[PDB]
Structure formats: C-alpha cells, structure tokens
Design a protein around this ligand. Structure first.
Ligand SMILES: CC(C)CCC[C@@H](C)[C@H]1CC[C@H]2[C@@H]3CC=C4C[C@@H](OC(=O)CCC(=O)O)CC[C@]4(C)[C@H]3CC[C@]12C
Ligand SMILES: CC(C)CCC[C@@H](C)[C@H]1CC[C@H]2[C@@H]3CC=C4C[C@@H](OC(=O)CCC(=O)O)CC[C@]4(C)[C@H]3CC[C@]12C
Ligand SMILES: CC(C)CCC[C@@H](C)[C@H]1CC[C@H]2[C@@H]3CC=C4C[C@@H](OC(=O)CCC(=O)O)CC[C@]4(C)[C@H]3CC[C@]12C
Ligand SMILES: CC(C)CCC[C@@H](C)[C@H]1CC[C@H]2[C@@H]3CC=C4C[C@@H](OC(=O)CCC(=O)O)CC[C@]4(C)[C@H]3CC[C@]12C
Ligand SMILES: CC(C)CCC[C@@H](C)[C@H]1CC[C@H]2[C@@H]3CC=C4C[C@@H](OC(=O)CCC(=O)O)CC[C@]4(C)[C@H]3CC[C@]12C
Ligand SMILES: CC(C)CCC[C@@H](C)[C@H]1CC[C@H]2[C@@H]3CC=C4C[C@@H](OC(=O)CCC(=O)O)CC[C@]4(C)[C@H]3CC[C@]12C
Ligand SMILES: CC(C)CCC[C@@H](C)[C@H]1CC[C@H]2[C@@H]3CC=C4C[C@@H](OC(=O)CCC(=O)O)CC[C@]4(C)[C@H]3CC[C@]12C
Ligand SMILES: CC(C)CCC[C@@H](C)[C@H]1CC[C@H]2[C@@H]3CC=C4C[C@@H](OC(=O)CCC(=O)O)CC[C@]4(C)[C@H]3CC[C@]12C
Ligand SMILES: CC(C)CCC[C@@H](C)[C@H]1CC[C@H]2[C@@H]3CC=C4C[C@@H](OC(=O)CCC(=O)O)CC[C@]4(C)[C@H]3CC[C@]12C
Ligand SMILES: Nc1ccc(Oc2c(F)c(F)c(C(F)(F)F)c(F)c2F)c(O)c1
Ligand SMILES: Nc1ccc(Oc2c(F)c(F)c(C(F)(F)F)c(F)c2F)c(O)c1
Ligand SMILES: [K+]
Ligand SMILES: [Mg+2]
Lengths: 269, 160, 160
C-alpha cells in the first residue's frame, strides 16, 4: 500500500477491536436482558455436539485434536523462519509459500475457536481466557496483512503460548494417566512456553526501537541471541556481553526479573 | 511470600447451571479415584437404555492430577465443584432444588465404623433440612445405626 | 584396550554393557590414538573425555575393601562426580572455543587456555558471572545455555 508510511498501527488496532469491541457485546447483552426481565432444545444439542467434538470422545474428535497438536507447532516454526526478515516489510499473497501456508493454519485456528466458544458455559469468562486472548492477538492480523499487502512482525511471539494446551490434549487422548508424568509435562510445557515468549518480546522491542524516540535506539539482535540473554537473566548469572539498551526493554526486564527468577528457581530442581 | 499469597484461589468455585429437559444428580461423601472410577464405569454402561442425566460431584478437598484427568476424560457429562454438604450456600450452588436424587458414598475400609455412620447421618440431616422432598440414597456400615434414619422427620421409605 | 575386553567378557547383557558411560568414553578415546600413530599426525579431539574415568574411583575403592561405611561412600561419590563433570565441561569449552565454527571456516576462534576455561566454568557454575571471560562462538554459547540448567542445580545441591 503505502511504502513510505509506517502501518504498524493498523495491525495492532485490528486485535484490540475484536477483544474490547467483542467484549462489550457480551456485557451489553447481559444488561439488555436484565432490563427485559425488569426435551432439550436445538441449541443444547448443538452445544453438546460441540463439546463432544472438542473432547476426544469420537474418531472425528480424535483427528481434530491431533491436528491441533501438529498445527500449533507448525505455526510456531513459521514464526522462527520469518523472524529474520525486517521488522515491517512488504510481501504479496500470490507469490509466496509462506503467507499462503500460514493462511491455512490461521483459518483452521478460527474454526477451532468457534467450536470452543459454543461449548463454553459462561461466555464472559471464556472470553477472558489465555487461549482466547492469544487467538485474538494472533489471527486477525494475518487477514489484515493479506488485505493491506503488507506485513509487520507484531505480537507474533504469542504463538509460543499455545504449547500449554499439550498437557490437556494428551489427557484428552488418554495418553497421560499418572501423576508424575502429568506434572512433568505441565512443568516442561509452561517453562519452555514462557521462556520463548519472553525471548520473542525482547527481540521485537529491541529490534524495533522506541516509538517516542522516532525509532533511533534500534539495536541489532537475533532471536537466538535474545534466547541466550533471557537464559542468562533467569539463571542469575548475568554477563555483560549482551543486555537490553532501550527503555521499553529495560522496563520489561525489570518486571520479568520479579517472576522469572522465582519460576526458574522452583521448576528446574 | 508475595507470590504465594497471590494466586491462593479456588479453581473449582462456581455454580451449576440447569438445563431445560435434562435431569441431574448430586454425588457427595467419600470421593476418591477408585470409588469414582467404579461408580462411573457402572453408571454410564452401554447396556442401560439411553440416558442423559448429568453427574455433579461435591467434595471439600481439591482433586489431584489423575482424578482431574479422569474428569477430563468424562468432560461433557461430569462436573466437579468444591464445597461442603453441611453448607446451605454450597447446597444452593449445586442447584439441589431440582436434583433428581442425591447419592452418598461411604468408606467401607474405615478404622471406626461408628464415626462414618455419624458423619453420613449428619449429611443426610443437612440435605433434608435444606430441601425436605429430595430423594436420598446412602450406604450404612452397621445395622443398629440404620434405625436412626427412620426417625428423621422427612425420611419417607414408601417414597424412594 | 585389554581392560575393555575383560569387562566385555564378564558382562551379562552385551547391549546394556555397550550402552554404558565407561564403554562410550573408551570408544571415543582409544581408536583415535591408533589413527594418529598411523597417519603420523594428531588432533586435539574428544580427549577431554578422559576426565570421566574418575567416576570408577569409588567403585574400585569398594572393591579393594577400603570404603565400608555410608558417609565415606557418599562423600567419595559426590567428590568424584563433581570433579569429573567440572573438568569434562571445561575440556569441551576449551576445544570449542580454541577451534572455530565449522560453518565459518574456523574464522571466529578465540584464544583460551584450559585453566582459563576452568576458571570461567567455576564462575558460571557459582552464578557469579564477572563477564571478563566468556564464550563467543555459536557452539560455545549453545553449550553454556544447556550446561547452566544442570550445572547450577548440581552445584547448589552438592556443595552444601
Ligand atoms: C497493551 C495495549 C493497550 C497497547 C498499548 C500500547 C501503547 C503503550 C503504545 C502503542 C502506541 C504508542 C504511541 C506511538 C507513538 C507515539 C508518538 C510519540 O511522539 C512522536 O511523534 C514521536 C517522536 C517525537 O517525540 O517527536 C509519542 C509517544 C506515542 C504517543 C506512543 C505512546 C505509547 C503508545 C500509545
Ligand atoms: C502498560 C504497558 C502495557 C505499557 C507501558 C508503556 C509506557 C512505559 C509508555 C507508554 C507511553 C509512554 C510515553 C509516551 C511519550 C513520552 C514523551 C517523550 O518525550 C517526548 O516525546 C519529547 C520530550 C523528550 O525528548 O523527552 C518521553 C517519553 C514518554 C513520557 C513515554 C514514556 C513511556 C510511556 C509512559
Ligand atoms: C529453547 C530451545 C528449544 C532452543 C531454541 C532454539 C531457537 C533459538 C532456534 C530454533 C530455530 C531457529 C531459527 C531457524 C531459522 C532461522 C532463519 C535464519 O535465516 C535464514 O535462514 C534466512 C537468511 C537470513 O536472514 O540470515 C536466521 C536464524 C533463524 C531465525 C533461527 C533463529 C534461532 C531459532 C529460533
Ligand atoms: C537441539 C536444539 C537446541 C536446536 C539446536 C540448533 C540451533 C540452536 C541452531 C540451528 C541454527 C543456529 C543459528 C545459525 C546461525 C546463526 C547466526 C549467528 O550470527 C552470525 O552471523 C555469526 C555470529 C558469530 O559467529 O559470532 C548467530 C547464531 C545463529 C542465530 C545460530 C543460533 C543457533 C541455531 C538456531
Ligand atoms: C512502571 C511504569 C509506570 C513505567 C515507568 C517508566 C515510564 C513512566 C517512563 C516515562 C518517561 C520515561 C523516561 C524518559 C526518558 C528517559 C531518559 C533516558 O536517557 C537516556 O540516556 C536514553 C536512553 C534510551 O532510552 O535509549 C533514560 C530513560 C528515561 C529516564 C525514561 C525512563 C522510563 C520513563 C520514566
Ligand atoms: C555426536 C557427536 C559426538 C559428534 C557430532 C558431530 C557433528 C555435530 C559435526 C561433525 C561433522 C560436522 C560438519 C562438517 C562440515 C560441515 C560443512 C560446513 O560447510 C560450510 O562451512 C559451508 C557453508 C556454506 O557456504 O553454506 C558446514 C558445517 C558442517 C555441515 C558440519 C556441521 C557439524 C557436524 C555435522
Ligand atoms: C543438536 C546438537 C548436538 C548440535 C547442533 C548443531 C547446530 C547448531 C549446527 C549443526 C549444522 C549447522 C549448520 C551447518 C551449515 C550452515 C550453513 C552456513 O552458511 C553460511 O556459511 C552462510 C552464512 C554465513 O557465512 O554464516 C550458515 C550456518 C549453518 C546453517 C549451520 C548453523 C548451525 C548448525 C545447524
Ligand atoms: C595444587 C593445584 C590446585 C595447583 C594448580 C595450579 C594451576 C591452576 C596454575 C599453576 C601455574 C599456572 C600457569 C602460570 C602461567 C600461565 C601463563 C599464562 O599466559 C600468559 O601470558 C599470562 C600473562 C599474565 O600473567 O597475565 C596462561 C596461564 C598459565 C599457563 C597458568 C595456568 C594455570 C596454572 C598451571
Ligand atoms: C586441580 C584443579 C581442581 C584446579 C586446576 C585444574 C586445571 C586448571 C590445571 C590442572 C593441571 C594444569 C596444567 C598442568 C601443566 C600444564 C603444562 C604447562 O606447559 C608449560 O609449562 C608450557 C606450555 C607451552 O609451551 O605453551 C602449561 C599449563 C598446563 C597446561 C596446566 C594448565 C592448568 C591445569 C590444566
Ligand atoms: N515496531 C513497533 C512499533 C510500535 C511499537 O510500540 C509499542 C509500544 F510502545 C508498547 F508499549 C507496546 C506494549 F503494549 F506491548 F507495551 C507495544 F506492543 C508496541 F508495539 C513497538 O514496540 C514496535
Ligand atoms: N577442529 C574442529 C573440527 C571440527 C569441529 O566440529 C565439531 C562440531 F561442529 C560439533 F558440533 C561437535 C559437537 F558434536 F561436539 F558438538 C564437535 F565435536 C566437533 F568437533 C570442531 O568443533 C573443531
Ligand atoms: K553478574
Ligand atoms: Mg456440562
């Protein structure tokens, strides 16, 4: 679209509209019926069918859950490859395997989000959930980028937060049954997911710059170097070879030192 | 200490939501992995005619990881809530007004038979006090303790 | 080599004897010496693995009927494991840092001595991290990242 102008605000605004705008629809609906008050129905059958499909209680349900396991990793790997490109770049949809394979993954994640929404009991507390939030902040920007014929390495690091669902879908598949294995898988998934997410956030903030500084603090870093930095920070070793140098990076590092250090001290032993 | 003080919360708090045209029952008492597995395996057998009643457990001890895995396996037809059957707030939370029956499991391999019977009697008294027309099915360990249930004002053996 | 054959003969299950630490260190240390004496040219390869032979000290001391109580056995086990793994990791760091990166035509090498590597690993394992010496190659950084996870816990659990 516009080569000269930065279009990062368009991608961020798309995610905030779906989350906050969709949230008020739930709240408005509840209050609207409140003033209205001053055999199973067809909706109940659909809801229980959606619940059965979400669980691994059918052959169709089993293959859907396996695909969720496979495509969650596939979407994460695509983020790794595309993290070496410039922060905000231009790419067309008709001449790239990437951004075309990614379309298949994100369309699938939209349908899977619909099934989870139907099977939920309280829509408000389903909306205020971590998986719903990561879906909100991951899916719409792909369509926005396809429409705009542009791209932006925005909050793509959140795709590593989908690793948490592995320990639950393995229990759905009746693979994990004992407490020791369940605990081990939980700990491993949580640790790896949060480590990678923090590394991605540091990578984005450092490579981009400071918006109020007109993007002049840009320090060239790679994702592997950021992973190394986060590992050294969590271990409380702290060499001086690499460190955050921008204001946002330092602020996030200060806030992450509070929690990540305790998590590392507790989980690894 | 701050990290521990924050996050001290009950993940199983909440209230059951009734569904029109579908019954449900409440199970309380001695809830454990083996007892729950046996009860579910016998209750949801395929030889019975098609049934669509929901099972709502109610215990005051948070379930462990493998019991949670069992509940995940029976995701769409079993629910768990944390609370005590001696609490009117919990009894109203589990929507016991419209429950078709209330089942009380017992601890057969208990050290003292009399204390278990006394606890079961208390639970029955509490449930009948909250709602005097619900149907109760319970297990008794000793015969001379079963005569006490015959003196509850609302205990009708002619009804089920 | 002869001592390896005697252990092989006396072994019960050859597969699980083959998949053993002492067998692996023998495999990775003995043949290169013959290769070197044939080619009339050497290479400082995986020769740092010779520090893993210190594990057997407690076992052979028990064989010699020297260690009989439990506290002495535990002390010798801890000391042997600690020293052996410290020296082995130091050797791997020394090799990786003194050599370059194979996918860089060995152009990013750093000049380090074995004592400097030992000091570096002690500082890292104690979670001090002065930063005066550190690994700069990709393989060195990767090995440090993986070594932190185990080494910090090992130190904090063994030294007290
Ligand atoms: C978690 C959700 C709610 C997102 C929150 C993001 C905000 C904290 C960021 C996103 C966009 C940022 C803004 C992007 C650009 C500018 C212009 C900038 O002024 C300039 O024109 C820059 C150069 C100059 O200072 O002259 C001042 C900061 C500001 C308002 C930034 C303030 C911080 C903002 C609002
Ligand atoms: C709540 C979480 C998710 C994000 C928190 C982001 C804040 C740390 C950002 C958002 C708005 C930012 C401010 C937006 C604009 C400015 C003005 C900026 O100054 C100028 O633009 C000109 C004067 C100068 O050069 O200092 C100095 C930084 C400051 C206060 C920024 C400091 C950092 C702020 C508070
Ligand atoms: C925490 C444990 C599991 C280790 C984590 C390893 C990651 C830090 C690795 C795994 C995959 C790696 C990526 C795989 C491929 C690429 C593309 C590569 O660039 C290219 O292939 C194109 C040319 C270029 O831009 O240099 C740059 C490094 C990068 C982003 C790698 C960065 C480091 C990554 C994310
Ligand atoms: C088993 C798991 C942990 C995966 C192991 C492999 C990865 C950790 C490797 C695969 C490709 C590697 C990357 C390949 C090339 C580069 C570029 C390199 O930057 C340079 O241009 C060289 C800098 C230097 O040599 O000092 C920095 C490391 C990095 C990102 C490497 C980091 C480590 C990576 C991701
Ligand atoms: C926890 C929440 C409330 C955020 C706390 C920080 C913010 C309120 C922002 C507002 C203005 C910011 C300051 C604006 C300008 C500067 C000067 C700046 O001086 C430099 O040499 C610039 C270095 C760089 O940012 O690259 C150092 C950071 C600092 C104090 C910023 C630190 C972060 C501040 C205090
Ligand atoms: C199991 C342990 C004990 C040993 C494992 C050894 C491997 C990790 C090593 C041995 C041979 C190495 C390879 C030997 C030579 C090359 C070619 C080398 O090619 C280039 O430098 C060209 C780069 C370009 O121009 O693209 C890249 C690294 C590579 C694949 C090396 C990668 C690392 C390898 C596989
Ligand atoms: C899993 C553990 C035991 C070993 C992990 C080793 C990897 C980190 C190594 C092995 C093969 C390496 C690759 C072999 C060859 C190349 C091509 C090489 O191409 C170049 O030389 C072009 C760019 C440049 O000059 O750096 C870039 C690094 C790369 C991807 C290497 C990156 C690092 C790799 C993946
Ligand atoms: C009983 C045990 C614990 C004693 C172990 C002693 C070693 C750890 C010390 C003794 C002498 C040291 C050496 C003394 C001098 C040098 C030269 C030094 O090369 C220089 O150019 C040093 C210049 C400088 O002193 O700044 C490199 C380290 C080395 C080999 C030292 C390596 C470590 C050594 C072998
Ligand atoms: C005892 C432990 C707990 C602490 C110290 C362990 C290592 C850091 C020490 C033990 C033996 C030392 C080595 C013993 C003998 C030598 C040969 C010595 O050779 C020379 O005098 C000159 C060599 C040359 O020509 O470069 C150089 C130091 C070095 C490698 C020493 C380096 C430091 C070493 C490996
Ligand atoms: N390329 C680029 C463009 C704008 C940027 O501004 C952001 C920002 F100031 C900010 F505070 C947040 C926060 F909410 F996460 F904190 C962001 F996500 C931002 F994206 C940026 O960081 C990078
Ligand atoms: N002089 C020289 C020549 C080749 C080298 O390649 C290696 C390598 F790339 C590698 F990954 C390993 C590892 F398996 F241990 F990791 C090695 F042992 C290697 F020897 C090297 O390191 C040094
Ligand atoms: K330090
Ligand atoms: Mg339900």
């Amino acid at each position: 679209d516009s080569r000269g102008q930065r279009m990062w605000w368009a991608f961020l605004a798309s995610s905030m509209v779906t989350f906050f705008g969709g949230l008020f629809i739930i709240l408005l609906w509840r209050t609207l019926k409140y003033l209205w008050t001053v055999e199973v129905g067809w909706m109940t059958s659909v809801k229980d069918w959606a619940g059965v499909m979400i669980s691994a209680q059918t052959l169709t349900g089993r293959v859907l859950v396996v695909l969720v396991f496979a495509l969650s990793i596939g979407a994460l790997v695509i983020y790794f490859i595309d993290s070496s490109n410039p922060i905000e770049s231009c790419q067309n949809f008709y001449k790239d395997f990437t951004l075309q394979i990614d379309m298949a993954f994100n369309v699938f994640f939209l349908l899977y989000f619909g099934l989870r929404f139907i099977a939920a009991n309280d829509k408000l507390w389903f909306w205020l959930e971590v998986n719903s939030v990561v879906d909100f902040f991951t899916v719409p920007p792909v369509f926005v980028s396809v429409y705009l014929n542009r791209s932006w390495l925005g909050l793509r690091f959140l795709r590593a937060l989908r690793l948490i669902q592995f320990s639950e879908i393995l229990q759905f598949l009746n693979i994990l049954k004992t407490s020791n294995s369940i605990k081990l898988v939980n700990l491993l998934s949580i640790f790896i997911s949060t480590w990678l997410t923090a590394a991605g956030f540091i990578h984005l903030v450092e490579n981009s710059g400071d918006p109020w500084e007109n993007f002049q603090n840009n320090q060239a870093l790679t994702y592997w170097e950021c992973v190394y930095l986060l590992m050294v920070t969590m271990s409380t070793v702290g060499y001086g070879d690499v460190y955050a140098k921008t204001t946002l990076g330092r602020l996030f590092m200060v806030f992450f030192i509070l929690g990540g250090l305790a998590m590392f001290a507790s989980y690894v032993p | 200490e701050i990290i521990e003080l924050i996050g001290n919360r009950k993940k199983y708090g909440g209230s059951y939501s009734a569904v029109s045209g579908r019954k449900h029952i409440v199970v309380c008492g001695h809830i454990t992995l083996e007892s729950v597995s046996n009860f579910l395996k016998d209750f949801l057998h395929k030889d019975r005619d098609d049934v669509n009643v929901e099972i709502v457990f109610l215990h005051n001890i948070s379930p462990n990881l493998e019991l949670e895995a069992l509940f995940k396996r029976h995701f769409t037809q079993v629910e768990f809530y944390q609370g005590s059957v001696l609490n009117p707030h919990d009894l109203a939370r589990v929507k016991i007004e419209s429950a078709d029956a209330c089942l009380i499991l017992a601890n057969k391999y208990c050290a003292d038979p009399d204390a278990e019977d006394a606890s079961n009697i208390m639970r029955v008294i509490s449930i009948k006090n909250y709602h005097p027309k619900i149907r109760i099915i319970t297990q008794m360990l000793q015969y001379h303790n079963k005569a006490h249930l015959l003196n509850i004002p609302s205990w009708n053996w002619k009804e089920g």
